[PDB]
Design an enzyme around this catalytic site. Structure first.
Site, PDB file in Angstrom:
ATOM      1  N   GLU A  24      28.802  -5.974  -5.979  1.00 43.27           N
ATOM      2  CA  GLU A  24      30.071  -5.525  -6.530  1.00 43.27           C
ATOM      3  C   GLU A  24      30.442  -6.511  -7.626  1.00 43.27           C
ATOM      4  O   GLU A  24      30.552  -7.714  -7.379  1.00 43.27           O
ATOM      5  CB  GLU A  24      31.161  -5.462  -5.448  1.00 43.27           C
ATOM      6  CG  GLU A  24      32.583  -5.632  -5.990  1.00 43.27           C
ATOM      7  CD  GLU A  24      33.615  -4.742  -5.306  1.00 43.27           C
ATOM      8  OE1 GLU A  24      33.441  -4.399  -4.122  1.00 43.27           O
ATOM      9  OE2 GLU A  24      34.619  -4.400  -5.961  1.00 43.27           O
ATOM     10  N   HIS A  26      33.164  -5.901  -9.821  1.00 43.94           N
ATOM     11  CA  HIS A  26      34.427  -5.323 -10.261  1.00 43.94           C
ATOM     12  C   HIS A  26      35.153  -6.071 -11.385  1.00 43.94           C
ATOM     13  O   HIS A  26      35.677  -5.451 -12.308  1.00 43.94           O
ATOM     14  CB  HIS A  26      35.345  -5.172  -9.043  1.00 43.94           C
ATOM     15  CG  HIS A  26      36.391  -4.108  -9.193  1.00 43.94           C
ATOM     16  ND1 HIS A  26      37.093  -3.603  -8.119  1.00 43.94           N
ATOM     17  CD2 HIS A  26      36.856  -3.459 -10.286  1.00 43.94           C
ATOM     18  CE1 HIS A  26      37.944  -2.687  -8.544  1.00 43.94           C
ATOM     19  NE2 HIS A  26      37.820  -2.579  -9.854  1.00 43.94           N
ATOM     20  N   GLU A  69      31.813  -0.607  -6.978  1.00 42.81           N
ATOM     21  CA  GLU A  69      32.502  -0.998  -8.199  1.00 42.81           C
ATOM     22  C   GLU A  69      31.745  -1.985  -9.101  1.00 42.81           C
ATOM     23  O   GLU A  69      32.099  -3.166  -9.222  1.00 42.81           O
ATOM     24  CB  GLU A  69      33.892  -1.535  -7.815  1.00 42.81           C
ATOM     25  CG  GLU A  69      34.684  -0.492  -6.997  1.00 42.81           C
ATOM     26  CD  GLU A  69      36.052  -0.959  -6.522  1.00 42.81           C
ATOM     27  OE1 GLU A  69      36.139  -2.041  -5.899  1.00 42.81           O
ATOM     28  OE2 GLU A  69      37.043  -0.228  -6.750  1.00 42.81           O
ATOM     29  N   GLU A 145      35.798   6.720  -0.431  1.00 40.53           N
ATOM     30  CA  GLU A 145      37.086   6.122  -0.077  1.00 40.53           C
ATOM     31  C   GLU A 145      38.216   7.116  -0.379  1.00 40.53           C
ATOM     32  O   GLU A 145      38.222   7.750  -1.438  1.00 40.53           O
ATOM     33  CB  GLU A 145      37.310   4.827  -0.870  1.00 40.53           C
ATOM     34  CG  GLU A 145      36.316   3.720  -0.563  1.00 40.53           C
ATOM     35  CD  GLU A 145      36.534   2.471  -1.409  1.00 40.53           C
ATOM     36  OE1 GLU A 145      37.700   2.136  -1.700  1.00 40.53           O
ATOM     37  OE2 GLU A 145      35.537   1.815  -1.775  1.00 40.53           O
ATOM     38  N   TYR A 146      39.153   7.266   0.556  1.00 41.79           N
ATOM     39  CA  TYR A 146      40.296   8.167   0.371  1.00 41.79           C
ATOM     40  C   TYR A 146      41.377   7.883   1.416  1.00 41.79           C
ATOM     41  O   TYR A 146      41.113   7.225   2.431  1.00 41.79           O
ATOM     42  CB  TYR A 146      39.865   9.635   0.462  1.00 41.79           C
ATOM     43  CG  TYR A 146      39.754  10.171   1.873  1.00 41.79           C
ATOM     44  CD1 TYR A 146      38.737   9.745   2.723  1.00 41.79           C
ATOM     45  CD2 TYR A 146      40.677  11.104   2.360  1.00 41.79           C
ATOM     46  CE1 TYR A 146      38.639  10.238   4.026  1.00 41.79           C
ATOM     47  CE2 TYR A 146      40.586  11.601   3.655  1.00 41.79           C
ATOM     48  CZ  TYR A 146      39.562  11.164   4.485  1.00 41.79           C
ATOM     49  OH  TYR A 146      39.461  11.652   5.768  1.00 41.79           O
ATOM     50  N   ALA A 147      42.588   8.385   1.164  1.00 42.01           N
ATOM     51  CA  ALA A 147      43.728   8.178   2.059  1.00 42.01           C
ATOM     52  C   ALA A 147      43.932   6.681   2.341  1.00 42.01           C
ATOM     53  O   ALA A 147      43.790   6.220   3.483  1.00 42.01           O
ATOM     54  CB  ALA A 147      43.523   8.951   3.373  1.00 42.01           C
ATOM     55  N   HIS A 148      44.276   5.935   1.292  1.00 43.05           N
ATOM     56  CA  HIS A 148      44.500   4.491   1.397  1.00 43.05           C
ATOM     57  C   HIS A 148      45.612   4.242   2.421  1.00 43.05           C
ATOM     58  O   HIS A 148      46.769   4.588   2.193  1.00 43.05           O
ATOM     59  CB  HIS A 148      44.878   3.937   0.019  1.00 43.05           C
ATOM     60  CG  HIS A 148      44.683   2.462  -0.117  1.00 43.05           C
ATOM     61  ND1 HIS A 148      45.734   1.575  -0.218  1.00 43.05           N
ATOM     62  CD2 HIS A 148      43.554   1.713  -0.165  1.00 43.05           C
ATOM     63  CE1 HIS A 148      45.261   0.346  -0.321  1.00 43.05           C
ATOM     64  NE2 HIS A 148      43.942   0.402  -0.290  1.00 43.05           N
ATOM     65  N   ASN A 205      46.180 -14.791  -6.296  1.00 40.75           N
ATOM     66  CA  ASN A 205      45.839 -14.042  -5.093  1.00 40.75           C
ATOM     67  C   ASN A 205      46.500 -12.685  -5.226  1.00 40.75           C
ATOM     68  O   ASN A 205      47.336 -12.490  -6.107  1.00 40.75           O
ATOM     69  CB  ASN A 205      46.377 -14.760  -3.858  1.00 40.75           C
ATOM     70  CG  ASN A 205      47.892 -14.812  -3.834  1.00 40.75           C
ATOM     71  OD1 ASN A 205      48.553 -13.798  -3.616  1.00 40.75           O
ATOM     72  ND2 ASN A 205      48.450 -15.997  -4.066  1.00 40.75           N
ATOM     73  N   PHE A 209      47.723  -6.947  -0.517  1.00 44.63           N
ATOM     74  CA  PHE A 209      46.753  -5.898  -0.825  1.00 44.63           C
ATOM     75  C   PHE A 209      45.461  -5.983  -0.012  1.00 44.63           C
ATOM     76  O   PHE A 209      44.563  -5.163  -0.179  1.00 44.63           O
ATOM     77  CB  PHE A 209      46.420  -5.875  -2.312  1.00 44.63           C
ATOM     78  CG  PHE A 209      45.784  -4.586  -2.757  1.00 44.63           C
ATOM     79  CD1 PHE A 209      46.491  -3.389  -2.673  1.00 44.63           C
ATOM     80  CD2 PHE A 209      44.480  -4.564  -3.248  1.00 44.63           C
ATOM     81  CE1 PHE A 209      45.913  -2.190  -3.066  1.00 44.63           C
ATOM     82  CE2 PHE A 209      43.892  -3.371  -3.644  1.00 44.63           C
ATOM     83  CZ  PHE A 209      44.613  -2.179  -3.552  1.00 44.63           C
TER      84      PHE A 209
HETATM   85 NA    NA Z   1      42.551  -3.781  -0.650  1.00 42.74          NA
END
Ligand code: NA
Ligand code: NA
Ligand code: NA
Ligand code: NA
Lengths: 211, 211
Positions: A24, A26, A69, A145-148, A205, A209
């Site tokens: 990754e 990103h 990513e 990935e979905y519905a966070h 940071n 999240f």
């Molecule tokens: Na996160």
């Protein structure tokens, strides 16, 4: 790639697994700066090839993933083909670069909505129902990935499932995610509390999240 | 096929036309009883071939239609191929037998809904958004009939156009229909009034369903 025991448990208790290479990038700009650079092909290939060589006999693993990513680079196309050649028994998916590139057998977007499009330049997140029928498209769609589920969330979850059930080629997805990445800390009285980004003096940071 | 002048007018004023063979056997049980009978192939072939021979030079005609509500028979596949062969310049469509048979280049259902499915046995009417992505489907979708404008109607019309604009392969449709098929009658005073099914002593009849 997970701790070896995870695959044994999934083999025995029964869970379909998507084994993903430890790649990754990103933070790069653009996201594929490294993955499209032939000089990083060697480092990337070991993360993919050594994963396959280690977990290819686990029945639980049904899909190989090239990572997360890291945009879409020629290194991805090369490694995608490497797997198809070495292990034709499992489909290969990768979301980078638009979720429907030449490096994935499955349309695997992250956070694409059920009915509403998000026409981002270059990497649009089409409504999943619409994505399926774009001119020429025939692949299945499973959201990586979905519905966070961040905090008080999962609103609109039923909308996805109504869609997954009505559309044959909409075959589900993976919710993001399972467990809050909070860490334990103790106050002066020795009492523990759940901490997150920045609670260890770490900076910059991204606060909460991580949950 | 219409009055020959119609095509000349559509050529000059600018309207896309679907030229349709004069073939409808809706009343048969099942609907394809005659269209799957090779003995009726000659009669059906003349209604299709003579249409093409007469109108093939009109630019307004962009699509040929094998007829209407006659189920799906082998005669349809035969005539579909005949046209593809003599006139490759125009696609061929036909709704009978499920709207997506081997006799049509276009998925052309009648009254299929936008989001709601109508899973009738053998000839289901899938939601048009879903129809497009059924496993293996790649053709464009244009409703040969939709938004039945009978009396105080056309509720939900906006829903179709929202879909037509969001999905590339949903390319529209033909509203049903243009003008009420009412006829003029005169009362004792001599005043004219609009009459429908049954107002001429015709029986059995389907009353106002002609408007
Ligand atoms: Na996160
Ligand atoms: Na499904
Ligand atoms: Na469209
Ligand atoms: Na009618």
């Amino acid at each position: 790639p997970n701790h070896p025991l995870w695959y044994t448990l999934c083999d025995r208790y029964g869970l379909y697994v998507v084994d993903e290479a430890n790649i990754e990038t990103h933070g790069m700009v653009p996201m594929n700066r490294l993955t499209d650079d032939p000089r990083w092909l060697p480092a990337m290939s070991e993360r993919v090839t050594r994963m396959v060589q280690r977990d290819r006999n686990h029945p639980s693993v049904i899909i190989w993933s090239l990572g997360n990513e890291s945009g879409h680079g020629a290194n991805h196309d090369a490694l995608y083909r490497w797997i198809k050649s070495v292990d034709p028994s499992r489909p290969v998916q990768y979301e980078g670069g638009g979720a429907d590139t030449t490096a994935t057998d499955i349309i695997c977007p992250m956070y694409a909505r059920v009915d509403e499009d998000q026409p981002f330049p270059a990497v649009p997140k089409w409504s999943i129902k619409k994505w399926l029928s774009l001119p020429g498209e025939t692949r299945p769609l499973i959201l990586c990935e979905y519905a966070h589920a961040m905090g008080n969330s999962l609103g609109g979850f039923a909308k996805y499932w109504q869609a997954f059930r009505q559309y044959p080629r909409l075959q589900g997805g993976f919710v993001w995610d399972w467990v809050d990445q909070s860490l334990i800390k103790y106050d002066e009285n020795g009492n523990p509390w759940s901490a997150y980004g920045g609670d260890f003096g770490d900076t910059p940071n991204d606060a909460q999240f991580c949950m």
